[model samples]
Target chain A: MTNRLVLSGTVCRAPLRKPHCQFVLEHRSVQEEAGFHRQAWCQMPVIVSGHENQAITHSITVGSRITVQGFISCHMVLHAEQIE
Target chain B: MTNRLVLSGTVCRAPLRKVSPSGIPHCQFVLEHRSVQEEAGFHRQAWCQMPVIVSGHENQAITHSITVGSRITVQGFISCKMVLHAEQIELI
Candidate 1:
């Protein structure tokens, strides 16, 4: 099976300093559905670990709007593979 | 902003049907995701119980046909409640 989620939203919450970057993203948008517009929104908790993500994570703070490409973990956290 | 998720998994729970306040049909179920995903040069075992919701009139019939243990792929957006709001479902 395959799993993937690409979300672009504002960083609602983020830790100032931590070994791993953890943040909550607030997403609100209108998605087209069957010729109609449907409202979509979500507050997702995301985790970015490993040094490979440090550079991007370092710049992430509250109100930072970015896109995250990742998979949802069993723990319900979005484990990020890339951030922009 | 844009939000989308594509997931393929087995329906691990029975679908619960209900009508929303706005008279929209809702089908709720749990999707079991078990796969291997590569991250940081390593292939990691990924497993999860993704809570899913199918809303609207067009998808109600297909949602009704789904049962536990049914394997399907869902394409949609994650909701504010941390649930997957399925826009399209493909049974496999």
Candidate 2:
């Protein structure tokens, strides 16, 4: 049972306050696909759903560079456990 | 420069082969993940049906050995609406 994702990128959207906090992260990097290196870019929606993350999530803003470690939901949201 | 996912799961769909306009080969499939993960000092069930694309002439050949029910670990990057671009596929 392994479902882990470590993504580092820039916060491109302002954090939203909700029952479950949310933000958009913009990632741009070079990745190896099929053993061939290629450019990779994506804007991923990240959820800060833990009670312990409220203060941190509230501090996030556009242009903040951070890494998020979490498990991905079926709907593809990155549910962050730690952000730094 | 980081956006990586290492997921271990079963192949839940048949692989579909496609060729790009420039003749790049692609093998696309879906992987179903069911696992218990720890978060915030608590345990949570994690699940997802991740669409994966294995592209390249050399990589497409390896996908032929994969099929529904095959258990594998995929190391890749997420792109374009959460689709995974596989860099390595390890059968487990």
Candidate 3:
């Protein structure tokens, strides 16, 4: 079973770079109140195994409102730059 | 491929009555600006053929926010008291 969370918010910053063509998406959500803002971050590591780049890039943007459905997985560091 | 569209909104009204043990959930999405509300309704016919009712009831509520991923289908009428939307409803 896959755990999915749908988030609709404005993109705060541009996509960042990782080692292997991966990008980081930073987003923030604002409530109806004036001073209530919740900041949440997620890393959208594109599974570009055989998918098209145009379709993947078109699905994501810097400031576009998007709904991402993915499973939650924990990342842990083993050594000096190795993450598993 | 399964077509999925994710919608996150609050439940507006309570579940309505249906003929075949399926529940209809009404929801509404509120915008930030004043008087800028778009009303888009969808019929969420529950698929409780084998699932437990406890989990299904907990999943459907009056004012709970939910994320639904479903395919867009068209429904057509065949008799009286049946009205179609912009597109006919299809049950796949």
Candidate 4:
């Protein structure tokens, strides 16, 4: 019982790999945040974590437009389920 | 379009409300979700953060009684509004 997302955005920043894999997922959408508009830029952290095969490494790169499928929370992400 | 969430988890903390008012009274807090689901034929554990919100009049009763250690389910879109516009919250 949770939320799922299918997002298509650009990799507008760097990818950080460490204890858990992290990256930026950016996309264009109508505004409901910080302002009122028909178009806006959105980005959030994609956090990937697991043991051995559960984690994703080097499957994404900066500037490579991609589609993502995962879950998000405040400062948390389940990035292991994206197209890997 | 934005990503939406259907979250069910324990209300691990006190609800945070806005400093002031609007027809849309907003309440927010973190939720811990855990379950097992399959992905690509593999049985996997689903542990997610449901940084959920409750808007409108419901935000009043919600922010107080359903304090720490309570279970709540919220459905809404992601970060489009930092205050995720959740139309409802269920006490379970």
The best candidate in terms of DockQ = 2
Cα error, residue B71 of model 1, in Å, equals 0.6
What is the TM-score of each candidate's chain B when compared with the real chain B? 0.92, 0.93, 0.22, 0.73
| Model 4 TM-score (2 dp) | 0.58
What is the C-alpha local distance difference test score of each model? 0.84, 0.85, 0.24, 0.61
| Clash pairs (backbone) in predicted model 3 | B74-B88, B74-B89, B74-B90, B75-B88, B75-B89, B75-B90
In TM-score terms, candidate 2 sits at 0.84
Give the range of the ten consecutive residues with the poorest summed lDDT in model 3 chain B.
Answer: B46-55
Lowest lDDT 10-residue stretch of candidate 2 chain B: B37-46
Q: Give the deviation of candidate 2 from the true structure as CA RMSD.
A: 2.4
Candidates 1 onward: DockQ, in order:
0.61, 0.65, 0.01, 0.24
lDDT of 1 by residue, B1-92 (tens): 66889999999998999996877777899999899987666788888888998877888888877899999999998876478888889998
Residue runs of model 3 more than 4 Å from their true location after superposition: A10-21, A30-53, A58-61, A76-84, B1-92
lDDT of 2 by residue, B1-92 (tens): 66879999999998999898978888899999888887666787889899999888876777988899999989888987578888888988
Docking class of predicted structure 4: acceptable
Question: For residues A1-84, what per-residue lDDT tens digits would candidate 2 score against the true structure?
Answer: 667789999999899998678999988888766455788788888988778888888888999998998888775678888888
Model 4 chain B: ten consecutive residues of lowest lDDT: B78-87
For each candidate, what TM-score against the reference?
Answer: 0.84, 0.84, 0.27, 0.58
Which lDDT tens digits does candidate 4 get at residues B51-77?
Answer: 666555644675676788888777655
- Over the stretch A4-45, how does candidate 3's per-residue lDDT look in tens digits? 223333334443333222333333432211122322233333
Candidate 3 lDDT by residue in tens digits, B1-92: 11121212222222232222454332222211111111112221211011001112222342232223222232111111111111121112
